[PDB]
Design a protein around this nucleic acid. Sequence first.
DNA 1: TTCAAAAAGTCCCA
DNA 2: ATGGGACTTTTTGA
Length: 544
Amino acid sequence: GIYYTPKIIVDYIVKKTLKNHDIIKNPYPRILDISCGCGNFLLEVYDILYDLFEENIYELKKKYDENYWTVDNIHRHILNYCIYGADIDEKAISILKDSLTNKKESDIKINLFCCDSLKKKWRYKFDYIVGNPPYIGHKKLEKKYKKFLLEKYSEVYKDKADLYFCFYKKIIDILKQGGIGSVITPRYFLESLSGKDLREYIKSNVNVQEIVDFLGANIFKNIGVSSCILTFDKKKTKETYIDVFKIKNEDICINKFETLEELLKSSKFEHFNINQRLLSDEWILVNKDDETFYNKIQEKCKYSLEDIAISFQGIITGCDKAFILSKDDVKLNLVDDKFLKCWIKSKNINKYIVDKSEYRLIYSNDIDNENTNKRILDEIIGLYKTKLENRRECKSGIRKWYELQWGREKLFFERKKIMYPYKSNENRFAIDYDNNFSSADVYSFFIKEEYLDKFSYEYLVGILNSSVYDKYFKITAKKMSKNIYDYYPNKVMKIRIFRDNNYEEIENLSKQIISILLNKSIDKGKVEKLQIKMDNLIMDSLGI
DNA sequence: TTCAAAAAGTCCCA
DNA sequence: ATGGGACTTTTTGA
Ligand SMILES: Nc1ccc(CCNc2ncnc3c2ncn3[C@@H]2O[C@H](CO)[C@@H](O)[C@H]2O)cc1
Ligand SMILES: [K+]
Ligand SMILES: [K+]
């Protein structure tokens, strides 16, 4: 339930919010952590504040009450007026209170609240806010609390949104005018469709000073999440430019230097600036060379995949072990071949073509009644009946216990089409010739009838598999973990395509590559040469 | 009725 | 034991 932020990052965030504070002008700053936990951030804040007060004690004594401002009174003052924490875990709050007391008679009152930060009536705003909020996705969040969030945090929380969206909104709302906030959250809201409303909220309510994007680097040990650090303020500024620090090597160990600033200035990161006013609903955080590249491609292409194609997600059985069998399984002798479909996984998809399938799907929707094919139900599917009965559509009666949860439309699959994995390190679009079915880890599309004369499957896999389109898609794609991007229709269908004088030769090269890849003695080397030639053709076409 | 999004991923090994 | 690499289910809101 508790996650420890590495000390280097905590130090960076506290220094980011407090390094230029004018303690003489305002000796009563309110610093808040609304998910403080054991006190990772607040103890460092206490250290920084103590040094800040102690270095200016005599100036404070001369400008204000000379009896109040003594070194012996610093500790008490810090706990009374400066440090605020909130967390829902009682034990963490008790431990933090003990630590803050032990940093150094009457008892000082420590501003630590044990509550739900999203429900607390906050009585005042704050000068500085730091911390690491909790991340809960749509599956792991309780439905009652989700009803609450959808009612009260609708500006950022809808559909498949995350709890830390609400923490972002809460932080922004309780930040004093001129205040500074700095947090570490998952990076996914920067590009995801669920994060659109949250991105709009941030852009329209704060000045984003700085974004540190670690991409697929493993910041939290033994945790599968990809992180970023956001720093924003509510200052009166007429410029609103963002400093973006994007990591270049995801294999880096984070403790190579003493400070995170040394790492950011180093050759391990790239830095660039983004105009906050030029942000659309999407945040395209790239350097000027990449921006030029992306804009050239966008302007030159007249069509998008959405215009010319029909997209769809694969089968969602709701229990794969009940419906998927190895093609050499003896139990398939009980199933009529009219009920069997070819089944592939994301790993069976290469550039341009699909591996031969090793699995079969029982399309159980076509089973009329339980008495005609009783053997299939009793001996194959029924072995998981309990689990099958706990699916949502079974509990509500919309679906029989032996039916596929989301069987889609068969006719969408039993046709020539293009398939691609839902998560990959590179563009892998293939032409499926074999009426392959797949789960939701594989997405498919086919070309609309009215665009068949303008675009062929061979040409499309030719350009989509090129290095140009690999880089082009990765510009705006959703970076998930190390060497993994989401390849989902909400972005894949936005890919723009072109049609010009190089169409015929690109198509010929694609057909040659496909012909070689379907041979017995594959000579992959000539495939690589042909791909290089096609990439040259594409770069000529797009004017890069 | 029925779409598609969602990594505090998941699991294994050296 | 940890860190790194291969690979990806079904719950869920709309
Ligand atoms: N199902 C569900 C039901 C209710 C909630 C309440 C959300 N409200 C919260 N308010 C304040 N602190 C919170 C918190 N949730 C977690 N935290 C702390 O955050 C830190 C993580 O690093 C931990 O120290 C954790 O305790 C969440 C999920
Ligand atoms: K004085
Ligand atoms: K990671």
